[PDB]
Design a protein around this ligand. Structure first.
Ligand SMILES: *[C@@H]1O[C@H](CO)[C@@H](O[C@@H]2O[C@H](CO)[C@@H](O)[C@H](O)[C@H]2NC(C)=O)[C@H](O)[C@H]1NC(C)=O
Ligand SMILES: *[C@@H]1O[C@H](CO)[C@@H](O[C@@H]2O[C@H](CO)[C@@H](O)[C@H](O)[C@H]2NC(C)=O)[C@H](O)[C@H]1NC(C)=O
Ligand SMILES: *[C@@H]1O[C@H](CO)[C@@H](O[C@@H]2O[C@H](CO)[C@@H](O)[C@H](O)[C@H]2NC(C)=O)[C@H](O)[C@H]1NC(C)=O
Ligand SMILES: *[C@@H]1O[C@H](CO)[C@@H](O[C@@H]2O[C@H](CO)[C@@H](O)[C@H](O)[C@H]2NC(C)=O)[C@H](O)[C@H]1NC(C)=O
Ligand SMILES: *[C@@H]1O[C@H](CO)[C@@H](O[C@@H]2O[C@H](CO)[C@@H](O)[C@H](O)[C@H]2NC(C)=O)[C@H](O)[C@H]1NC(C)=O
Ligand SMILES: *[C@@H]1O[C@H](CO)[C@@H](O)[C@H](O)[C@H]1NC(C)=O
Ligand SMILES: *[C@@H]1O[C@H](CO)[C@@H](O)[C@H](O)[C@H]1NC(C)=O
Ligand SMILES: *[C@@H]1O[C@H](CO)[C@@H](O)[C@H](O)[C@H]1NC(C)=O
Ligand SMILES: *[C@@H]1O[C@H](CO)[C@@H](O)[C@H](O)[C@H]1NC(C)=O
Ligand SMILES: *[C@@H]1O[C@H](CO)[C@@H](O)[C@H](O)[C@H]1NC(C)=O
Ligand SMILES: *[C@@H]1O[C@H](CO)[C@@H](O)[C@H](O)[C@H]1NC(C)=O
Lengths: 178, 392, 199, 398
């Protein structure tokens, strides 16, 4: 099929995952924390500093050509998937864990599809060895409020990363085909 | 016995719900026929399945249905005489999506436009993933056959749709099913039949009218019995509220009535008159007719000749010849003749250019019918002509 | 008259570029006032050099994208009878609202008597719509129905109306909106077109 | 003359920062007084420059002119890391054979303890679980000023302390959800907060009945009472305790209902199943007797067929797994006619190993569209077993 239908399927899957993540984020904010759903509750982020950020400039976003963006997106996807698995092991609720496992396996399928697309475009970089230090990330001894704040910041960063990845895929579609 | 691997490689996918993949059973094996189904995403293998002992035709495929992924499934045959697999098939679950029929269908009247009828519905949760094409079917509540709307008009996803060029005052029912835009995929079920009426669309047809020449006796003023038939439902386009007539008399003089009932009693004199009617719908007045009554000393004025009547197929038929100059309107009446039984005068309207037209009623056989045909001219009618004819 | 609490609601017309917004008091004052606006954005400083067409617009310029930092602004008024201030916070994703599109024209087709073609243009103030996919919202309705029909469209500057009447004209009002960030904008100015009729 | 007691001296003072309990001990100089005069010892607690919160008096008597060391404890309403605390002791001797004036002793020198900051925790306590409605006060130690404090959308009033410390007074706390309620202290540029849990003690487990499928293991099922509102790592833990053998089984935390496992020891026949409920708030127990021979419940026999020689008619033979070589069975057999009559009868069998059984019938009938259905039980009077699949394998007629 080539890069024609594959990129369209990836974009549709990213849109579906964005909708599912929006629904899951609404549910998680309504469930976890009385001062979290109705109030603003924007505290300074001093607890989460290990996960990769998604703060890039416009010029450095337009300078890349379909390779560094893909590598960084793969690394961020792996890290966020590990963190989501940790959050899943942390949470304890039947329907919530079911929806979380559904989202996790859908994100894993999307990552596999992205890896297949990368291997299909003819780039001699199939799969570089990622991490292996945070490959498990066991839950350390911390407070419950700190863990809740870390989970909230992780969800926000994952939403921002999904939006940035959708915009970057749109930019790649604009730069590649026409 | 040989394993008799399954075939036909055909099954559907549901919108997030549990999906079962169907396969053919085959022939009578009866040797621990318990198949298994596999799944593969080329990066991760899902858990295998097990064919049901009751109906080993379909089982679970994937608990969490994911779209836009390459799923490889194959049904393996396992028995005592070795093992064998079947043909492999690669399909996309997004192509075999079976959506839900749109619910809450409702039609409304916007601004009394009798030409366009809008319809709205709610699209399912799959509208954000696949493009849906629509095929609306409508029909009359009386008819049993359906009418299909051209599919090329609703080939794209739309929230509302308006059907144009409909019939006035006839109830329609609607049901809609959707599928993928391209066409590769299974259809959906039929939605709930939604009712709905059309607009008013006042009738642009002049109703019938006929008077009487009853022999009044009060030395002058004549009591004429104005009788007109009831307008048919399709020819009326709405509930008949009331009838309005108009009487013509000497210069600068005219009267009219608005009686609810379909019967009027207006006096006459020794001068020429002209009576017109006009039915009023909910929006306004309809078209009128024409009729003159010079019953003072009028002559036959070339009455119609050559009157023959023979049913000859399952119903009575009337035929005559064309008069000398021309004819404007045609009208004929009939009733049942028997031993001391009053018969009512039932009639109908016919065009002038037509000379043969079968009657429409509920007459029976083995009875004497006196069909009387009376012509209509510009200066009064002609003398009546009666003829007897049986049915069977 | 002492000053009251002003209204502060900002809007971003261009997502890649900066944003601009104004501030006004609900009750007018017969004497001129002096305003001073400053931006923090966490721990930083913004100048937003002022050169607008209408006053009270400093045209804050963006520097980082997807920073996940809630932008906050604080205004301050002054008067001979009192001095109030207002601090309002928001995000860089909710205030995104483009400008209504211009040059919206329609044209009938000579073959089909119930089909119309609508072709509009992208707003000039908005950046390249090919890089940032937009979402248009077309509303076609006759001049006497007064009942708008909502139809959502995908990326594209063309639409084929298959629901148009054959003996009445229509009006088309289209809006502009990004793919997944922001809300809907205002509609177009006007539109007029008649279907084809054989004679 | 007026006799005054000697000024007491504090021997050693300490406290536990985990449970916030003060420890105080002192040795009275009773060796210089041979008489058993009643001594009235009173203790006073004072914080943040002698507030004099609560007084307490302890009456005792010396031991025959000997110095006896004794320990006294007290639980404060606030954590020790909230403010400094001083302790003072004094006594009042009361002699019976003295008519003079007895005046109280002089206060001992001041003795205080200071919590040295060792961790970055600024809010106390840390994950404390108490009974619902109890009064608990929080403390937020810091070096800067704070704005306000609240639990959720409440904005409760604040109380200042001596040095840059704020405390809140909460009364009659409400119930908590699956997640513990969070309290926070709004600062100028930061925010500090902890989590507190408020649940109910474990209710008494009702409907304690134990049945057995085979005579090899025991299973028990019941249902809890009121919810404890503490799910996760602080959930309840049930444990069974045996009378004679002393065996015990631990419950595996994973629901609506659950069943445990208890391996049977031979030649015991008597057990007093006691369920112990562990919880940091309360404990409950339940003692219910059971009979391993009177609470037997057989299983459904599977893999049985019908076949016989040209002699007398069919002889059923079912396969029931387990160990029942000691106790017999009372499996009642029922045969049904062609949807007209269903006869009922009962037969007896001996103990067989893990194999099929032997049941004989007599004076049957031709085909006549007969069916079969089995249902077994035990010699003891208890519940029956589940039904099996119907079979109609009949022999030839005529
Ligand atoms: C669309 O029409 C359906 C049936 O015509 C209606 O469904 C009703 O929905 C409400 C609320 O969900 C229920 O309380 C009623 O029992 C439903 N049935 C009826 C006959 O009222 C409703 O008007 C519309 N449905 C939705 C989901 O909006
Ligand atoms: C700033 O505006 C506020 C409100 O817009 C003013 O507050 C008013 O103060 C007077 C006198 O105390 C009250 O009678 C009014 O009810 C207040 N208005 C409210 C509460 O809406 C205030 O005076 C203004 N000036 C300053 C310097 O704050
Ligand atoms: C509180 O306890 C401290 C102990 O840290 C006392 O400080 C001692 O004071 C005496 C004389 O006043 C000195 O001889 C010691 O060296 C001090 N100990 C130190 C500095 O560790 C203090 O007096 C007690 N009382 C008050 C009111 O602070
Ligand atoms: C804590 O407050 C609640 C109410 O907010 C109290 O519950 C009330 O208790 C009284 C009797 O004690 C009842 O008559 C009321 O109907 C209860 N009201 C509600 C809403 O439940 C509760 O008793 C208080 N607890 C303590 C320890 O004071
Ligand atoms: C029944 O089993 C219990 C198992 O602990 C035996 O032990 C008694 O347990 C109860 C618990 O409430 C204690 O109050 C008794 O003091 C225990 N008794 C002994 C001897 O330790 C109990 O003895 C058994 N009952 C009989 C009649 O033997
Ligand atoms: C089996 O094949 C036939 C075509 O001969 C057709 O009905 C369909 O493709 C398959 N049907 C089922 C039920 O699998
Ligand atoms: C089903 O058939 C297979 C075929 O060999 C057999 O191994 C198995 O025991 C049968 N029963 C079940 C429950 O799988
Ligand atoms: C009187 O007129 C009304 C409409 O104006 C209509 O119901 C009908 O023609 C008449 N009423 C009855 C009861 O016949
Ligand atoms: C009947 O006559 C009245 C005046 O007498 C007039 O207002 C009304 O319009 C007339 N109706 C019709 C149908 O002409
Ligand atoms: C703005 O300017 C005014 C005077 O021009 C000054 O009083 C004020 O401190 C400045 N800053 C703010 C935030 O108002
Ligand atoms: C248990 O039951 C058996 C037989 O039913 C009986 O012999 C025995 O005494 C019972 N045990 C007790 C403690 O009653």
């Amino acid at each position: 099929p080539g890069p024609g239908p594959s990129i369209q399927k990836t974009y549709d899957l990213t849109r579906y995952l964005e909708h599912q993540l929006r629904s899951l984020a609404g549910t998680y904010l309504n469930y976890l924390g009385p001062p979290f759903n109705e109030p603003d509750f924007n505290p300074p982020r001093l607890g989460a500093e290990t996960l990769p950020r998604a703060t890039v400039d416009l010029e450095v976003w337009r300078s890349l050509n379909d390779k560094l963006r893909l590598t960084q997106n793969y690394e961020a996807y792996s890290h966020l998937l590990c963190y989501l698995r940790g959050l899943n092991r942390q949470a304890a609720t039947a329907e919530l864990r079911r929806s979380l496992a559904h989202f996790c396996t859908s994100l894993q399928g999307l990552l596999g599809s992205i890896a297949g697309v990368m291997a299909a475009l003819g780039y001699p970089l199939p799969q570089p060895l990622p991490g292996t230090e945070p490959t498990w990330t066991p839950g350390p001894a911390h407070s419950d409020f700190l863990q809740k704040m870390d989970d909230f910041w992780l969800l926000k960063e994952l939403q921002t990363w999904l939006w940035r990845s959708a915009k970057d895929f749109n930019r790649l579609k604009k730069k590649m085909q026409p | 016995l040989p394993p008799e691997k399954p075939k036909n490689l055909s099954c559907i996918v549901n919108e997030g719900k549990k999906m079962r993949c169907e396969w053919d059973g085959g022939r009578e094996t009866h040797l621990e026929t318990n198949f298994t189904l596999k799944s593969e995403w080329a990066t991760h293998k899902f858990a295998d399945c097990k064919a049901k002992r009751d109906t080993p035709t379909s089982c679970t495929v994937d608990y969490s249905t994911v779209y836009f992924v390459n799923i490889e499934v194959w049904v393996e045959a396992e028995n005592a005489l070795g093992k064998v697999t079947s043909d492999h098939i690669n399909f996309d679950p997004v192509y075999k999506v079976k959506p839900n029929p749109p619910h809450n269908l409702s039609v409304i009247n916007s601004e009394e436009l009798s030409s366009i009828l809008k319809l709205t519905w709610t699209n399912p949760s799959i509208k954000s993933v696949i493009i849906l094409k629509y095929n609306i079917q409508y029909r009359t509540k009386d008819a049993s056959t359906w009418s299909q709307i051209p599919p090329e008009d609703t080939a794209s996803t739309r929230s509302s749709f308006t059907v144009q060029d409909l019939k006035p005052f006839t109830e329609y029912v609607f049901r809609i099913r959707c599928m993928k835009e391209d066409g590769k995929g299974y259809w959906s079920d039929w939605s709930e039949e939604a009712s709905g009426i059309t607009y008013e669309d006042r009738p642009s047809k002049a109703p019938s009218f006929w008077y009487k020449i009853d022999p009044s006796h009060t030395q002058g003023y004549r009591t004429v019995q104005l009788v007109w038939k009831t307008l048919p439902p399709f020819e009326a386009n709405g509930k008949i509220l009331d009838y309005e007539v108009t009487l013509t008399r000497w210069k600068s003089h005219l009267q009219n009535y608005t009686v609810n009932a379909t019967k009027l009693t207006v006096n006459l004199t020794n001068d020429r008159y002209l009576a017109t009617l006009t039915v009023r719908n909910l929006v306004g007045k309809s078209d009128a007719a024409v009729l003159t009554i010079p019953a003072c000393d009028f002559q036959a004025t070339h009455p119609v000749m050559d009157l023959k009547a023979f049913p000859k197929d399952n119903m009575l038929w009337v035929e005559w010849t064309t008069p000398r100059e021309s004819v404007k309107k045609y009208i004929l009446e009939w009733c049942v003749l028997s031993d001391k039984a009053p018969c009512i005068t039932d009639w109908q309207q016919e065009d002038g250019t037509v000379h043969r037209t079968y009657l429409r009623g509920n007459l029976a056989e083995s009875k004497c019918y006196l069909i009387t045909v009376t012509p209509v001219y510009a200066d009064g009618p002609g003398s009546p002509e009666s003829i007897k004819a049986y049915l069977k | 008259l002492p000053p009251r609490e002003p209204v502060l609601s900002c809007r971003s017309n261009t997502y890649p570029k900066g944003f601009y917004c104004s501030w006004h008091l609900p009750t007018p004052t017969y004497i001129p006032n002096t305003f001073n606006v400053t931006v923090l954005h966490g721990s930083k400083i913004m100048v937003c050099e002022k050169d607008p067409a209408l006053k009270n617009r400093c045209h804050i310029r963006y520097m980082h994208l997807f920073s996940t930092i809630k932008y906050k602004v604080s205004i301050s008024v002054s008067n001979a009878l009192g001095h109030n201030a207002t601090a309002i916070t928001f995000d860089e994703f909710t205030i995104v609202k483009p400008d209504p599109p211009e040059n919206v024209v329609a044209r009938p087709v000579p073959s089909n008597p119930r089909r119309l073609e609508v072709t509009w243009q992208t707003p000039s103030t908005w950046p390249d719509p090919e890089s940032f996919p937009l979402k248009f919202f077309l509303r076609y309705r006759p001049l006497i129905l007064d009942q708008w029909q909502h139809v959502e469209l995908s990326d594209g500057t063309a639409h084929t109306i298959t629901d148009a009447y054959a003996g009445k004209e229509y009006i088309i009002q289209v809006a502009a909106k990004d793919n997944e960030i922001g809300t809907w904008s205002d509609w177009s100015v006007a539109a007029h077109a008649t279907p084809w009729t054989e004679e | 003359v007026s006799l005054i007691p000697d000024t007491p001296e504090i021997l050693n003072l300490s406290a536990d920062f985990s449970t916030s309990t003060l420890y105080l001990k002192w040795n009275d100089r009773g060796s210089v007084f041979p008489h058993r005069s009643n001594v009235i010892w009173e203790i006073k607690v004072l914080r943040k420059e002698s507030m004099e919160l609560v007084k307490l008096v302890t009456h005792n008597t010396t031991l025959n002119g000997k110095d006896t060391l004794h320990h006294w404890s007290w639980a404060s309403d606030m954590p020790l890391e909230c403010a400094i605390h001083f302790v003072e002791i004094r006594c009042y001797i009361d002699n019976l054979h003295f008519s003079g004036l007895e005046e109280w002793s002089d206060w001992s020198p001041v003795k205080n303890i200071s919590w040295i900051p060792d961790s970055q925790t600024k809010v106390f306590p840390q994950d404390k679980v108490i009974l619902v409605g109890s009064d608990i006060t929080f403390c937020c130690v810091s070096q800067e000023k704070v704005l306000s404090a609240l639990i959720g959308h409440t904005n409760c009033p604040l109380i200042h302390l001596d040095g840059e410390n704020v405390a809140i007074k909460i009364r009659n706390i409400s119930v908590s959800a699956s997640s513990g309620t969070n309290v926070v202290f709004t600062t100028e540029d930061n925010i500090f907060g902890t989590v507190i849990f408020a649940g109910y003690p474990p209710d008494t487990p009702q409907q304690l009945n134990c049945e057995t499928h085979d005579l090899k293991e025991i299973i028990c099922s019941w249902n809890p009472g009121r919810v404890t509102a503490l799910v996760g790592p602080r959930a309840t833990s049930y444990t069974l305790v045996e009378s004679f053998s002393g065996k015990y089984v631990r419950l595996k935390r994973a629901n609506e209902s659950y069943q445990l496992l208890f391996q049977m020891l031979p030649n015991q026949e008597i057990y007093n199943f006691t369920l112990n409920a562990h919880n940091p708030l309360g404990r409950s127990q339940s003692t219910i007797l059971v009979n391993i021979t009177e609470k037997v419940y057989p299983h459904t026999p599977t893999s049985f067929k019908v076949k016989d020689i040209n002699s007398t008619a069919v002889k059923l033979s079912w396969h029931l797994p387990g160990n029942f070589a000691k106790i017999n069975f009372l499996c009642e057999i029922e045969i049904k006619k062609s949807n007209s009559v269903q006869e009922q009868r009962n037969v007896t069998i001996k103990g067989v190993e893990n194999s099929s059984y032997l049941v004989a019938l007599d004076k049957l009938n031709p085909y006549t569209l007969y069916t079969f259905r089995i249902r077994c039980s035990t010699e003891t009077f208890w519940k029956w077993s589940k039904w099996s699949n119907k079979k109609q394998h009949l022999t030839t007629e005529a």
